[PDB]
Design a protein around this ligand. Structure first.
Ligand SMILES: CC(C)[C@@H](NS(=O)(=O)c1ccc2c(Cl)cnc(NC(=N)N)c2c1)C(=O)N1CCOCC1
Length: 236
């Protein structure tokens, strides 16, 4: 997250840190709890990942430094990547992780609702991107989970900024005209969460962008509402 601020304990209880454990243990991607055994994340996170054996999902984490040899985590039973996924920039950047056991909900770990049936025309004005990602192109994973409020931009404006890519109705973009606040490397797969009528909804999944927080180069996210049928089919 570029231009973000430190989050506090229990602030984003759906946010998870997905770690890889080979050849070293490190934060690979963000993700969101959407059910008792389900994490919604980005397909691009799994590039070169041999199998789910090397993955660990840590929930209720604020600082990456909290993760020690005795920190509880969930094993990953299955990785379900959308069958049309090719590369983040081309879309379908969505994946589900089925956990080896169920998540017991607490103040520190809770699911986030998907955009609701009947809310297709809602104009979201309170959207936040969170993650342990870079604060600039050449940086490192951050210790404390960062947050930044970002305004959504129309698909029409987004397409004008990315004339080399196909910005489809299955993507949603967000960014300030002058840049400054945005997602970056390491925020991949995490949520773009929007609060509407005091209820948080998982509107986007962090996917890609040209640079980080660059002027007129908004972040591009998987448009979750367009995958609700796919999510429901895979989770049932
Ligand atoms: C367009 C690619 C050359 C590449 N661009 S990048 O500058 O290296 C970069 C890297 C990661 C980013 C993530 Cl995860 C989120 N948001 C960004 N930018 C933004 N919100 N403005 C990211 C910018 C990029 O996005 N990815 C991510 C998807 O897998 C391929 C590499």
């Amino acid at each position: 997250i570029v231009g973000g601020t430190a989050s506090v304990r229990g602030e984003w209880p759906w946010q998870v840190t997905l770690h890889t454990t080979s050849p070293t243990q490190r934060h690979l991607c963000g993700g969101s709890i959407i059910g008792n055994q389900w994490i919604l994340t980005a397909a691009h996170c799994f590039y070169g990942v041999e199998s789910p054996k090397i993955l660990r999902v840590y929930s209720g984490i604020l600082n990456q430094s909290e993760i020690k040899e005795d920190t509880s985590f969930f094993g990953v039973q299955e990785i379900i990547i959308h069958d049309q996924y090719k590369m983040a920039e081309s879309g379908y950047d969505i994946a589900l992780l089925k956990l080896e056991t169920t998540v017991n909900y607490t103040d520190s770990q809770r699911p986030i609702s998907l955009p609701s049936k009947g809310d297709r025309n809602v104009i979201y004005t309170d959207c936040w991107v969170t993650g342990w990602g870079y604060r600039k192109l050449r940086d490192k994973i951050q210790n404390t989970l960062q947050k930044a409020k970002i305004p959504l931009v129309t698909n029409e404006e987004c397409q004008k900024r990315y004339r080399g890519h196909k910005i489809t109705h299955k993507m949603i973009c967000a960014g300030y005209r002058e840049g400054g606040k945005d997602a970056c490397k390491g925020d991949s797969g995490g949520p773009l969460s929007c609060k509407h009528n005091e209820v948080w909804h998982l509107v986007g999944i962090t996917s890609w962008g040209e640079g980080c927080a660059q002027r007129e180069r908004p972040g591009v996210y998987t448009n979750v509402v367009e995958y609700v049928d796919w999510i429901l089919e895979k989770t049932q």
